[PDB]
Design a protein around this ligand. Sequence first.
Ligand code: HEM
Ligand code: HEM
Ligand SMILES: CCN(CC)CCc1cc(F)c(F)c(CCc2cc(C)cc(N)n2)c1
Ligand SMILES: CCN(CC)CCc1cc(F)c(F)c(CCc2cc(C)cc(N)n2)c1
Ligand SMILES: C[C@H](O)[C@H](O)[C@H]1CNc2nc(N)[nH]c(=O)c2N1
Ligand SMILES: C[C@H](O)[C@H](O)[C@H]1CNc2nc(N)[nH]c(=O)c2N1
Ligand SMILES: [Zn+2]
Lengths: 420, 414
Amino acid sequence: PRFLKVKNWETEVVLTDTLHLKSTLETGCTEYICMGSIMHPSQHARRPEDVATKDQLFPLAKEFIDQYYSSIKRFGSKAHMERLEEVNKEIDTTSTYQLKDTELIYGAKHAWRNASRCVGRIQWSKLQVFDARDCTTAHGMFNYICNHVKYATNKGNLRSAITIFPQRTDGKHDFRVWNSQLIRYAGYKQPDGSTLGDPANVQFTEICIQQGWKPPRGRFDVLPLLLQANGNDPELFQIPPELVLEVPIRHPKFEWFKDLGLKWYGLPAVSNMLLEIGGLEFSACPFSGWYMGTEIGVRDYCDNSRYNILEEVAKKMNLDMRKTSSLWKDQALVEINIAVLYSFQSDKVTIVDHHSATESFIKHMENEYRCRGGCPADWVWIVPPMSGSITPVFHQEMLNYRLTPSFEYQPDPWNTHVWK
Amino acid sequence: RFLKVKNWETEVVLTDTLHLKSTLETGCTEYICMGSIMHPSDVATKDQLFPLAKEFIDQYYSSIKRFGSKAHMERLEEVNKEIDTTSTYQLKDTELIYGAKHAWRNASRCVGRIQWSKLQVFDARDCTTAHGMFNYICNHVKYATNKGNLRSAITIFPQRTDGKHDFRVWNSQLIRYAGYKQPDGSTLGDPANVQFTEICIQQGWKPPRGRFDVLPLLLQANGNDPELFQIPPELVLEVPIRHPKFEWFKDLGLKWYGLPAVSNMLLEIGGLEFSACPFSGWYMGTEIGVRDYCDNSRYNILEEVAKKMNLDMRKTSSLWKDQALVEINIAVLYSFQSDKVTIVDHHSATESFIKHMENEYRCRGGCPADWVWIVPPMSGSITPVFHQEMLNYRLTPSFEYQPDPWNTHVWKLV
Ligand code: HEM
Ligand code: HEM
Ligand SMILES: CCN(CC)CCc1cc(F)c(F)c(CCc2cc(C)cc(N)n2)c1
Ligand SMILES: CCN(CC)CCc1cc(F)c(F)c(CCc2cc(C)cc(N)n2)c1
Ligand SMILES: C[C@H](O)[C@H](O)[C@H]1CNc2nc(N)[nH]c(=O)c2N1
Ligand SMILES: C[C@H](O)[C@H](O)[C@H]1CNc2nc(N)[nH]c(=O)c2N1
Ligand SMILES: [Zn+2]
């Protein structure tokens, strides 16, 4: 039938999903095969890669404008029918169209709202949108990003924000932030074959060096920005450090902890994803919010191809690291995440633990099913990477489907950029 | 067609061709994923049974390099004779053992499948009464427990006939502790089991009304009223739960049974339905340490453990819950290993399953897997499966869920 129930097996709440009937693009799954643990399951875009014909772009534009005007209790109004014919002539005469300030804000907010993988979405409508569509150079991108960071950091009282550079036009004039996130630490391939800093960014850190960045070759070296405007070669910019809020990691009991010389930055800011609205593609749209403690303390510190400080922390803890069954990783993991939370909170840097976040997300689910007929959600990603079953989401059935507007992954620019 | 899955921690990339052999539905659509739905959702006619039988027989004779052979073709013919004359058919012992092993191998939710081929199959298809079932299961338990050196085993009771003569183990698992709701709303024992405990008590069981009462087997044979039987106490191997560092942990009075034995599922081989097929392995620690003890609607000992740990329970962000969950799980592992009862920690088990998965891709062309279930319920990202992409599809033979027998049985006595 035309309904799909999700059940929470810890509370027996059953929600009834009709919103999935609006899903537009494929999840990757078939009746015969589920792909819910595939990181990039589908390539079902809504258009061909480079500027699409009218009969391609306009149907997507019409659908979005239709949604925007429906959202605001119009549809068929004078302004809706005018906007349609304005988008028509704009596509006719430029092969694209330009979003209104209102529609741009609506779209950004809803792409966040539709981010199935985001546990933080209860905040979705409280997003600050910086319109950077007038930007024309990497210097201008740098100014816009600096302001983003300064506004978003707000001295630790972090604030959600997105800065939207111009939409893709022909595909050779992309605006891109080459950094995956606005603030990452460098990773250094060492002579022996080990790795100093953040191993995830070894490749990006080398592009930076290979572009003239002079690496301090330390553990927590903030990477420069590598900004690409209107398709041109990317340019390095050093973020003013007074804008990169950093928290030294200490522990509320293990005083030897701060002597591990660990710190992390306060602002998570995804800068390599693509924001899609009415078939328009915003290839540079850095968006930031605030950390769930597990992202630093479980993934950034404890993944094997990341900082991998589990080994160290357990040593100092005097744990039996002979076998796995002492749970020495699990014990050290918990202590590390206590430290991360405690440090952020002591410095009044906005952070949320995985209990509070997951609980917020269940509330948001309820809110969404009540007012929207559903809420797309990716269990594989919503469930935090430690203490899964002692959080409310583990026991929460989630329907996952693709609504638009949305954030999409996109090739890393260096796989695609022909240099000049 | 092919399909690739990536491990994002190691970058290993396996290629799945075996998904082509799936048929049963995942419940996902092309536009919705149901990968976190627990149950995404009565007797086959002759026409339905023919191709299901054929497919299984074909697959069995393929697995033993006798496809197209004379013995293969007579078997197919023999099966068809039965489905005509008797509207069903009877597995050979070879086929039953193979089918049971492959239902395990095909169990996408099971992290323990590296052991699938070492499965001790007990053919109980001659059983006719609940007493026979009691006997078969006692022997199952005694064999699988093996004084703490646990052995995988399944006991398979007569397949479904018309649906009106089903064999069922009414117990969800062979060994479970009873739960009793109190007038005041509190719960003694295992809160997950209060319903079944009521049913047993209703059937004449005199409960000791303690924290760790092993429930009685409630056995149904041939569609008759189920009957109560008390597992001989000396067959229930049990581990008192102590902690290697906290001398006070033993004062929690905690124990758990050593033998995990699922009895509420249905084994499907070649379209035949084995509604009673209890199977057993050994525990991953977190099944006891994270879920049995720490699920809020289970034994919920995080409160007590945290208190005796002095943890600050005012703010979640102290991670008292997290920190106490670990110590509970250390205790569970230490307790079993000390008593030389088989158990596997989540790290060892996920590691073995990655090697198994890779091997299954190598020799079989894939390994369906339910990431939502394969990832342990604690410390997920620090185990290799977390970073391992996985394809979920339904291969037959398979273990399937089935309705609880008290929601479908129509009673015979009085
Ligand atoms: C405000 C606090 C926020 C929190 C606590 C939060 C939390 C998270 C977490 C934990 C993830 C998974 C992270 C990972 O392991 O990679 C995630 C993913 C995501 N978030 Fe949020 N988020 C927040 C704000 C935002 C904002 C402001 C946006 C967009 C404007 C957003 C959009 C997304 C998207 C698109 C993903 C998917 C990323 C991917 O697929 O790689 N989030 N979020
Ligand atoms: C030998 C050691 C084994 C280990 C360590 C093991 C471990 C596990 C775990 C942790 C689960 C998840 C269950 C949950 O968390 O609720 C599971 C599920 C499952 N196991 Fe295994 N298992 C083992 C043996 C077996 C055997 C012998 C069979 C059958 C012959 C089997 C069939 C299954 C099935 C069908 C499921 C799915 C449960 C469901 O769909 O609800 N397993 N196993
Ligand atoms: C495949 C996943 N990988 C590759 C991109 C992610 C690695 C990574 C690196 C980061 F610096 C980082 F912040 C994240 C978390 C994303 C996030 C975004 C927002 C807006 C808020 C929040 N709290 N978290 C993930
Ligand atoms: C989905 C319903 N589940 C969770 C609510 C019931 C709880 C429960 C109770 C058990 F006694 C139990 F063994 C399991 C795990 C199943 C299993 C089977 C085998 C062969 C080995 C093993 N190690 N584990 C789950
Ligand atoms: C809602 C969700 O599907 C449900 O809690 C599942 C998640 N994954 C699981 N994984 C295992 N191993 N055991 C479980 O009981 C569950 N429960
Ligand atoms: C293979 C698996 O899909 C992959 O490791 C996913 C699992 N879930 C995740 N969940 C979050 N939040 N972030 C991640 O990077 C991942 N990785
Ligand atoms: Zn799916």
